[PDB]
Amino acid sequence: VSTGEFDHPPFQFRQRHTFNTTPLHDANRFGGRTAYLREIGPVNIKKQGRRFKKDPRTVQFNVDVWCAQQTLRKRWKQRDWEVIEIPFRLVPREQQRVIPELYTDIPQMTDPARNDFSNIRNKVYDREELQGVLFPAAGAMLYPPLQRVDKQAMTLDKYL
């Protein structure tokens, strides 16, 4: 549901900088990438040009690679986590099952019987709850345990 532009504008009569119109390879499109596509100047057709830069299919392919990079980039900035490979024994009760690979079965609910329905795929675990498991060697806990909020405590929002 993005508002951004995913399509390169079609070649036509030369666009110029106007109210309501900008040049085709103007620096403001695709975050200035259009540099890669630009033949500057009053191009002399017969003698000069770089053919791929006016070609619709080629140009659009390039733009599509750039969009893909944008999405990839933002999906990785979106991660706060690493995948760690933990032996079956030591893992929390919810993962003790079989977990079909991606796009293999129906998107899968973590624990329907305990009232948790969410993708097991996207469930993220706290480095602090897995401490005993991930750093057994260390003796004394490296990360201090999470402090949690009493939801039965009388605090400012309960009006007391």
Binding site: R16, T18, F19, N20, D26
Partner: protein
């Protein structure tokens, strides 16, 4: 301002004739209004414009009212008079927008598109990095690097 290059100026009437497509596109009109409101100034001409144009849009698919022939031509002239009124109500707006935008850009340390006036700062059109090495309309040579309108600290 990101769009820096030399540009082509269109006569006000053709800009207004774009109606819903540009001049009255809701999206654009709203951020004009935002500029005015933020400066603490009523936007009356914008509101007149929005009224006229709103209604233009509502009836835009209807046929015009049936004309009875008159030697007077009072009808034709009254329709015309009303029409040029509306045209002028909108000229005033179009002017306001260019005016305030240039002024606000002067306050924000913004550099305008090539060959553009900013009243206190660049009297003759401001230019830097044009495709052509002289200032287009002065016919004077341009310095490297691009001329600066504002003192340095930010």
């Amino acid at each position: 301002n990101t769009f820096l290059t030399s540009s082509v100026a269109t006569p006000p009437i053709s800009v207004i004739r774009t109606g819903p497509k540009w001049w009255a596109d809701p999206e654009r009109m709203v951020r004009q209004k935002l500029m005015y409101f933020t400066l603490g100034v009523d936007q009356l001409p914008l509101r007149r414009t929005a009224v006229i144009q709103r209604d233009l849009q509502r009836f835009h698919m209807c046929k015009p009212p049936p004309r009875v022939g008159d030697s007077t031509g009072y009808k034709r002239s009254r329709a015309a008079q009303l029409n040029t009124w509306y045209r002028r109500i909108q000229y005033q707006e179009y002017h306001m927008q260019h005016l305030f935008t240039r002024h606000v850009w002067g306050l924000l340390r913004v550099y305008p598109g090539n060959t553009t006036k900013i009243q206190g700062k660049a009297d003759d059109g401001y230019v830097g990095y044009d495709s052509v090495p002289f200032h287009r309309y002065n016919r004077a040579p341009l310095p490297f690097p691009a001329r600066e309108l504002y003192e340095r600290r930010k």
